[PDB]
Paper text:
Here we describe the 2.3 Å resolution crystal structure of a complex formed by Sac3 residues 60–550 complexed with Thp1 and Sem1. Crystals were obtained of the Sac360-550:Thp1:Sem1 complex that had P212121 symmetry with a = 78.2 Å, b = 84.1 Å, c = 165.5 Å and which diffracted to 2.3 Å resolution using synchrotron radiation. In addition to the previously determined structures of Thp1, Sem1 and Sac3 residues 255–551, Sac3 residues 82–255 were clear and easily traced, but reliable density corresponding to residues 60–81 was not observed, possibly indicating that this region was disordered. The Sac360-550:Thp1:Sem1 crystal structure indicated that the TPR-like repeats of Sac3 indeed extend to residue 137 and identified unequivocally the residues in the three major helices. However, the crystal structure showed that the residues that contributed to the three additional helices were 137–153, 157–177 and 205–213. These three additional helices both extend the TPR-like solenoid of the Sac3 M-region and also cap it. Remarkably, in the Sac360-556:Thp1:Sem1 complex crystals, Sac3 Arg256 was completely buried between the PCI region determined previously (residues 250–556) and the additional three helices (residues 137–250), where it formed a complex network of H-bonds to Asp293, Ser289 and Met203, and to Arg286, Ser289 and Lys238 through water S213 that was augmented with hydrophobic interactions with Ile256, Leu261 and Cys200. In addition to the three additional helices of the TPR-like repeat region, the crystal structure of the Sac360-556:Thp1:Sem1 complex showed that Sac3 residues 90–125 formed a remarkable extended loop that linked the distal region of the Sac3 TPR-like region to the N-terminal region of Thp1. The loop made extensive contacts with Thp1 and buried 1528 Å2 of surface area. However, the second positively charged cluster centered on Sac3 Arg256 that has been proposed to be involved in the interaction with Mediator was buried by the residues in the additional TPR region below residue 250 and so was inaccessible in the complete M-region structure.
Residue numbers in the entry:
A (entry chain B): 1 to 455
B (entry chain C): 27 to 41, 57 to 89
C (entry chain A): 79 to 547
Amino acid sequence: MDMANQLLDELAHGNFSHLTLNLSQNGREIAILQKQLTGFDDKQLETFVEQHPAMPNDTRFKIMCTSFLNYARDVDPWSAWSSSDLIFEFYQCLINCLINDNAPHIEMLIPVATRETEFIINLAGKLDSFHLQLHTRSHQFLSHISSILSRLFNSIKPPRGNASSTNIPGKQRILLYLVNKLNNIYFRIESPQLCSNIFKNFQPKSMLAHFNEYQLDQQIEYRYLLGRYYLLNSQVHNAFVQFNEAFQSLLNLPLTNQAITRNGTRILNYMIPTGLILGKMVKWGPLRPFLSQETIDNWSVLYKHVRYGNIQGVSLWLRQNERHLCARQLLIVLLEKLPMVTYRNLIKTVIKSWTTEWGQNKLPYSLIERVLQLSIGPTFEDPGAQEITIYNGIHSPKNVENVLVTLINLGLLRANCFPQLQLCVVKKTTMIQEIVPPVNERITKMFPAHSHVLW
Amino acid sequence: KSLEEDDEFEDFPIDTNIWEENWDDVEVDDDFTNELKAELDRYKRENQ
Amino acid sequence: PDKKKKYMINDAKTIQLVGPLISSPDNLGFQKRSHKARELPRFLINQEPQLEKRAFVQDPWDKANQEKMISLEESIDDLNELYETLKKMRNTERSIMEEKGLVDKADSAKDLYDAIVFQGTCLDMCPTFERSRRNVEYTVYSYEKNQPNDKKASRTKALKVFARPAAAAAPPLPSDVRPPHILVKTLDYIVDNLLTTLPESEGFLWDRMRSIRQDFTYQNYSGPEAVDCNERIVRIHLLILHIMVKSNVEFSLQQELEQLHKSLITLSEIYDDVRSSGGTCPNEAEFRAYALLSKIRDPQYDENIQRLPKHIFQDKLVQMALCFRRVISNSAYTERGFVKTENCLNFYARFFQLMQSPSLPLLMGFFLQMHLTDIRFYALRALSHTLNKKHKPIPFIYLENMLLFNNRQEIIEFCNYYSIEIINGDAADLKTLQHYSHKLSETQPLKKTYLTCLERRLQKTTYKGLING
């Protein structure tokens, strides 16, 4: 039997059972096809498609069918590189068949395209790892895929304001799927800022009235990537609400698979430090299934240092954790934004025993310098610290006023300061929260985040 | 190994209060805090 | 065009290393077939700049023709005759070099499937043709003449101008572009001869250093010479920033800082490509640090630095720059299009402590001086929010030590610029500060300034020593 003629019959009628680049699914059929297609030249393969009786009269669809015959004829299963031109050519031809919303068989093709997208992404990473041997630039393959998926994303149009039916076309059903695949790629090629256009144009293209109408797994991953994108731009609160909702939604998933535990862990790796910057600390109970005891112990040490105002302990903790923190883009933001929460707690204790207990309204700078001496410890100027570091070069006990000024400007300390009297005055009261309000409320009121529920 | 340590979510076949209400009220005597209170005592005693 | 077709790597050891698509294709009926070599897909074309030195090669006719232009420059005493005859020769030269395949035809920019590896062959610091042109156009700097009263540009002193799109509608010829070792030679000449002519030569040097970097990009060259030239040019920019501000000579900090930034971007790209190839660049850490100071509030650069190797990240210079980015951060920094972020330090006091460290590299300090006014504004803005309504004005002595103003006149002019009322001639009534942004809407920024301690350090060294490290 002429299996090429059989294949084209299937493709012409939207039966794509065998239209796949995955030989672990397609192998025996492709092998038979390769044997039978051997001997026919490119123009002959093209003609087989052009003249096939039921073939949709669509240029891009025939290009795609022909591209697959070429692939089947010339594929070398022993060499992923040698076969790659056929594989990536066909994939591009396949996605091109989705650009027109009224393309032939587009609805049957949507599942094919997602299936093949997962295949080609994996193959692209494989080949990109050999870029030096292949004389290609870093991420050239996977970046080519991002461009293809980007053109597809741009072709998805929003619903007509007065649509005649509720039908969710395939391109809309995979809108968030595509957003996440594309943004994941941009993160993997180490260009996360390319997510900007994707994030910006996601909601305008969506036909669904509520973000919660998408699959919950796609929601969670979206919030995960959006939270990371925010955190890359140091927008801590904007990131927090996404990580926090991402974990909440995940807790609402049945833990059918281990990958869900590990995905929850991925969220917590960012939700914990993000919340800490905002003055929030987790209850480990609901987190036990997703974190090892050691990771809990580790974040609990940092919790202790921040909670009680030990700047030196925070810096030591960041120093010890530097490598993996850099890998998750967490070191700088924590280095920068943990201090003032730690300072707040430092002077919180000071004001508690000094004002609330001992009834002293005035804070002499000399006192706070002594407190900072204990909290900061060593500095770039001090002996034994010949070389400047991000851990000894930022915080100094000498800059009492500066610390207090920023605490007051962030709204974490309600106080007046007298530079020529070298003291700051708090309100004479027994209620500590009147002088040092709850951190999270203050920060979140100064930096209101966008609606945690996107829409 | 790479799929389990990478920050990218893993694929899986598709089918509550987690935050301390407040940590300013829940006060636990800490080592660093003990030395801080001691420094407040020493400062209070050395200064009128 | 019909350049020779390019084919995919069919090397055997490569194929074996990359591996197969499936484990046992024969089990599924596949037979090892001798597939004919197929051409390289468009998306796998590699236009990555050259990373390694290549032997200098010059076409024999090109060499003889440039020697002829030199001989005519020496023999034709008339100024306009030289330029007219050299213009004729250039017309002949273009079509000739086109036919040789050594310059893209000016007919149309062609697909990058067929790109020419362009090699510059100008062995002077300025092409002979340009010298004769700028002679006619009276755009020869005094620095480019053997004698001051000369009208002809000197072959030994003239420096190629940055090519502007207004001119050069057609691609530059090899004779227009200096090869890497001549670009090094040219920068060597600047460092040895022209640094001391600053500040007066700022427009000259700025333009000529732009041209050096441009010639490298004409040749798509990211080799060692391009790194070295961009590195030392960055340093010259940093030196210029201080010299121009100290002297009070009117200049465009904007244009200096733009090209400084663009040069750092170039360096970051080369450092990346070199890392991808397994090489290394010894000065990378220094210029990653400078890059961290070019956009001191842009989180993108904190992102990029956190993914570099440990030895780069932990380099004292990168550590110093990171400290500065941290003390400078401010949750109240205000500017159209800047998003404020949480819990920033606004450690202005620490900033001025670090600016005074003798461990601060001087050229880094020069870069950080760009932010003196901004940091000072937000220091006073923050401090004023802590003062009660009836608090006395803050004496100048206090703010001068706190913000390290150079003298009383500077803090007076500062308060005047931001309409901070001055009481008793020696005090600042901070409550009268009504601005919440360092950038005033309807007036130009306050002039850039400097720190006395960094000027004093500069006077203790040489410009040349600073540029060479």
